[PDB]
Amino acid sequence: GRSVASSKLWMLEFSAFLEQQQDPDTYNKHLFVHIGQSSPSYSDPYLAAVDIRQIYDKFPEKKGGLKDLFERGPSNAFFLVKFWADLNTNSSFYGVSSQYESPENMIITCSTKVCSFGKQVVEKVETEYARYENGHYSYRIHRSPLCEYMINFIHKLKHLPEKYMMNSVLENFTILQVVTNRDTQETLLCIAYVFEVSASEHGAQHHIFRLVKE
Amino acid sequence: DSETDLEALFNAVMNPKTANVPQTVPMRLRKLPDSFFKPP
Ligand SMILES: *C(=O)CCCCCCCCCCCCC
Secondary structure, eight states, X not given: OBOEEOSSOEEEEEEEEEEEEEETTEEEEEEEEEESSSSOOBOOTTOOEEEGGXXXXXXXXXXXXXXXXXXXXXXXXXXXXXXXXXXXXXXXXEEEEEEEEESSOOEEEEEEEEEETTXXXXXXXXXXXXXXXXXXXXXXXXXXXXXXXXXXXXXXXHTOSSHXXXXXXXXXXXXXXXXXXXXXXXXXXXXXEEEEEOOOTTOOEEEEEEEEOO | OOTTOXXXXXXXXXXXXXXXXXXXXXXXXXXXXXXXXXXX
């Protein structure tokens, strides 16, 4: 399906999952959200735009915050992803995986901030190194453990008696992902994530928007 | 109080009479594309 790309970095894959081990040879994986999983990943200009001012309140502000990051640019690195998450699932491993491609050989930092009412609750920071691949360079975060806060959050979501209550909680839950060139501090990708519960028979869904000034 | 209080966040929806969280504008009331609310 549709993925996210700036001029310098393309995120081909993104997934959050729960993996259950029945026996040493049998593994069951449930995907909560996914990009570039069901069908080959792609990027094109056909996606819609969202006024960034409409979402500033849902993410950390001040120095280093979404507004500060957006103003510094480049503007083509900023995206909003709306996830419809598949929560229908019941040894366990909660994980997150992502993959990136760049024409450039960089050392990159991936910062993921979980936010409640626009306030940072927890941050995970990962440093990723390049591997040569067909003239370009690939970066991979493989099976990174989901933080306990997110595990706790998912548990509490599932224990809500009504699904509409889950949506009410998700109203004020966001994630901001900032992928940076470690040396230059250039914003390679900045992705704002918003969530709803999926009711689709196809499971989890997503829609990607460009973040713009209006 | 704390805005990042996990129990408070879930208490607000489970027991609305005891809700103690910031008040916000629901996304559905904001200037956003229709595709933001309708899955593909
Ligand atoms: C803790 O380390 C924060 C890291 C968060 C990684 C993003 C995972 C996306 C969560 C999707 C789960 C769906 C919950 C509605």
